[model samples]
Target chain A: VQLAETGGGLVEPGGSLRLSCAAPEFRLQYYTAGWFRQAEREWVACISAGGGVTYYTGSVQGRFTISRDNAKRTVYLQMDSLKPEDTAVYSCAADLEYSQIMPSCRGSYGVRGQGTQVTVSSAH
Target chain B: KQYPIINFTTAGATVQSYTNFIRAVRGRLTTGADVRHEIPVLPNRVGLPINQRFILVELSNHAELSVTLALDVTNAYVVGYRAGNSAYFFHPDNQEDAEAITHLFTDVQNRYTFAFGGNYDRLEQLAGNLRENIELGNGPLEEAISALYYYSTGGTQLPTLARSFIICIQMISEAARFQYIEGEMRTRIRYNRRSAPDPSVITLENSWGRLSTAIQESNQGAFASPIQLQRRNGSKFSVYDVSILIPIIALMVYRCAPPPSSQF
Candidate 1:
């Protein structure tokens, strides 16, 4: 599925940021997807999907949220109080298995989206 | 840059697949079956585009929802769960993505069991942007990945020390122009030792020393050159030499000045 960072990827260090993944041609509810933060060439964060979940602890617990829209075939990630270090390209990926979690399923594959550049203010 | 094609047979779980699933991590030579230690197995080495990083898990839908929690296993982090019969996990080798992914599994594994309805094949995007950012030069990410592979392989090098030196260090380090030249000297020495074994080739250490000396001189700005810097919110620009502008500035001043008769 394709993902893009909203607001043109510009964010103030202390401000909040909102980004999204849109799967227009496909239905969103049939599979699983999450947000991935590519800090440089490496992926620093991979937020899994669910009923608007947040980290239990560490760098992005309550600070980040992942929610979804079945009808719209879209997923949303809202992060709060971003720092300059939070500046990185964010994208999304998904497991291409059947929608229903099946015991006999062989869903070991996933798809990734091109990243959207997000640069935080460097005033500090 | 060759990638191995992985075709898992529709065969049962008993069918053993490839040898090493995870690419070797360089440092932290610890190992165990648990997540905190070396993961008994890493995800398959499938070709993930430069922009994308991924990992897979093979848990069963009946896995008892017990000790499977968010856990750190070496530099690559991973978390697993079964949403019913399907075993699913959120994983990426890099620590940052792995840690956050653990939470995702904990939150969703118990819920969201339904998953199959799409008809058309879901699509894939070109990994152009992320690949460019990471592969352009030996930036921090590339360096770390290299370090990981180096340590993981137990510091194994090429057949010869000279060959290893060129493969591992000379070609990889992000050197400036002078540094590049210095690297070349050592490179030549390494090349000669294998091809001709000539004493004419400078020793690697001495070549390095001479290069350092040249850098020391350049650092003092003993050489005249244009300055380069990325413009904030703008395109790249280079500073031009002012020597060419000296005569032009003098001429402009002469023309703008009042005539000799008008000066008084």
Candidate 2:
């Protein structure tokens, strides 16, 4: 039920950033794992996991990708053309399901990873 | 039925406040308690215009936890509930509640009389005001207004729209409170003299009222229609209110402005 995320640091503008969440204790087949991020003190769902399908927000549709490695029991978030506004603490969660109509973290049950801080620096 | 009651407050009605409220409820579930949580209605004088009290009753056993969200505005009613892994939200069935949701989400030209009643134009004016304030050296306001503008204009989903509306009001509050120039004071005086309130504030109050009514009506369950949950098929994710990249560019430009002439 524990999740750990890695690969975060200062990223240059227009650079590609990839972060990984490792879940060694849980079985990926039975449980749903997804990504969420905290930016400017507000949490936004990046991707939702359920029914063996993954859904992403339009904000990160083209530039960001969420993929899972079943064998490694890990989920990864990748984003390109990094901008300073993209700086956020990205975390992964498991065992929670989201309503399709309004995809929010409210009223859902889950375990969240201790987030990895990703800063897209201004100095290019 | 008596259950362990946990009480929390959403006085600010900010995203942080909402997050903390959710966390508290989640914590109760972990403690193995079938709990009843009370959220008192915020006073009209403080923060945002959310004046509806909510009572959440959770029935948790070893295998599952079910929740019922009830609103006690004038009378108590069930708005929604969580069963198994899905949460259900009831649609408003009454005119008052329906109109409130409409005014908050879809009304473009009737609610406000300032500039254009369209949401985009109103947000544009606010952004313009923030831009002017930025020249006075309130740098963070620029970022706040930019996020407010982005979310209001681009995000149309219910929760996103709601948060954006809150951000808009917050930016206005901060702008008015932090301004150093007498120009804002003059505007305020003029507004007061005409017995005309700030149009944006009126809009905020109206929107907040509408949201409150919608929530209250949903809880009544008597008139609300339950929205069925469906599986989303690769749907585009809705974006929430976010501070964007505009602030960096604004700062760079602000820094490059010519130095003020010396008073000789």
Candidate 3:
């Protein structure tokens, strides 16, 4: 399935940032969507899907919010009080076999988007 | 890269696939049975492109005997064999394999896929723009520019152009991070059989090692040299000299000029 990301640009510190991934070919109810953060050298799993439910990692427990629009076939990630360290490339992927607890199923990404680059700069 | 199904047929042997969660063709081969396996790399997942040229295949057990297997190498340029996940990639080094890899890099239709963040078109444009800014003199810069152009145009000269293009792009714009671009190159190098010490891979590693030092040296050079302003008369003045002279010149001009006279 093809995936595309939107709403990526410069954001001032303390501002809110919203990014969305559109999976037009996917059925949200049947498939699971995953959001990933590409830091300097590591791939941090921010959110994942399992059994028709969305799960968040501990690192983004309270700081990030993930939601899905089944009608529009899209998944969104939102964060407020942006910091400079939040600058990264956000990627979304789809998984056929998903599990929140199983590491194997959690890391099995089927199709992924091209990703969107987000920059959180100081408003100096 | 598409994840291909590995089918192993053995006589009196049990073959089991491992659950690594990662994307590699992994399985176990047992002794006591003659094994025949074929891995097809043509199929892709949904809408993804099958651009991978190398496949890493790991077999567990039966490490003593030289295992014989068949592979559909019509699309794959390099196939890596390892006894286990911890073992380094080992294959019978051959001329055709090296030449095939070289062809993969040099082929005009072949585009290196970036798993992370990078733009091939932008890189090509940047290379062209940087090449235009340099003079046509015989130097390292010239060679590097040429190499960058070749690499951006789907050719193989990454080692020669890595540092130059990276430095030039950083100087021109902050569009992408050095680490990301370096990561793309590293991924490409690894996908093209990094375990085998190919000349290109070795040079790329050396270049990667020296990149940080080069960036530091460039930053130091930028601070060590003062900005110089040149006049129409061919005289040059440092930034400090200009700052000191500007106010004095303004004061002299203000005093030397006649005051305004009242007119009725």
TM-score for all models, in order of appearance: 0.28, 0.30, 0.30
DockQ for the candidate 2 complex? Answer: 0.01
Candidate 2 error regions (>4 Å): A40-52, A97-109, A122-124, B1-264
Expressed as tens digits, the lDDT of each residue in A1-124 for candidate 2 is 3577899888988899888888665444334556777884443333433344556666666777777776687778888888787888888765323233124434232556798898998664
Leading candidate by lDDT = 2
Q: lDDT of each prediction vs. the true structure?
A: 0.34, 0.39, 0.38
Q: Scoring model 1 with DockQ, what do you get?
A: 0.01
What order do you get sorting by lDDT, best first? 2, 3, 1
The TM-score between candidate 2 and the true structure equals 0.30
Better-scoring candidate (lDDT), 2 or 3: 2
CAPRI-wise, candidate 2 is: incorrect
Model 1 misplacement above 4 A = A1-5, A40-57, A97-109, A122-124, B1-264
What interface RMSD do all candidates show, one decimal each?
18.1, 18.7, 12.8
Instruction: Please give the range of 10 consecutive residues that has the lowest summed lDDT in model 1 chain B.
Output: B248-257
Candidate 3: tens digits of C-alpha lDDT, residues B102-186: 3222223433332221222333354453322332211222233344444444563533343344332321111111222223323
Model 2 per-residue lDDT tens digits across residues B1-264: 222233322111222322343445433323222111111222222222222233344432212222223232222223333333333333555555433333221213322212222243354354443222222111222223333234334433433333333332333322222121122322322111111224333332323333333223433212143222111232233211112111200101001112344899
lDDT of 1 by residue, B1-264 (tens): 211222211111110121111112111111222121111222222332322232222221111211121122212322333322223333243565444444443334333211321111110012112211222211222232233234223462322211222222222211111222223323332211112112212122123323222222332323145433223233454433433212211001001111134445
